């Protein structure tokens, strides 16, 4: 068996410097991390080196436009390896934070 689209989605909150300020408990089943170990850590620390420049350009688009769709990128999984993700980013103003809807494209059982 393999997980559905909703069971492969998790929410995350970030400050304007990309650091995690909140993470959905769902990330544990998908990528292995516990939300408490991600807090205060920049999301950039987890990107695959080949997705680095693309994610930088997407973050720059998210800041100028306020909303962005990342495209496919890899995130380093806790016990090694990388999962492929697709995020929808939205900046909350009145800039206060970035709300992310992260969907794991990889096959998760």
């Amino acid at each position: 068996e393999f997980k559905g689209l909703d069971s492969k989605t998790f929410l995350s909150e970030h400050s304007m410097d990309m650091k995690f300020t909140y993470c959905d408990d769902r990330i544990t089943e998908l990528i292995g991390y516990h939300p408490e170990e991600l807090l205060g850590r920049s999301a950039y620390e987890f990107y695959h080196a080949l997705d680095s420049e693309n994610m930088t350009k997407s973050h720059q688009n998210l800041c100028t436009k306020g909303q962005v769709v990342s495209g496919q990128y890899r995130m380093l999984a806790k016990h090694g390896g990388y999962v492929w993700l697709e995020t929808q980013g939205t900046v909350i103003y009145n800039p206060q934070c970035i709300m992310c809807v992260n969907y794991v494209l990889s096959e998760i059982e």
């Binding site: 689209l5 909703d6 989605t9 929410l11 909150e13 939205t90 909350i92 206060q96 934070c97 709300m99 809807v101 969907y103």
Partner: peptide, 13 residues
């Protein structure tokens, strides 16, 4: 989710 036709839900801060 753009891979689906699920009903759209609302996310809030």
């Amino acid at each position: 989710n753009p891979y689906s036709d699920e009903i759209e839900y609302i996310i809030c801060t």
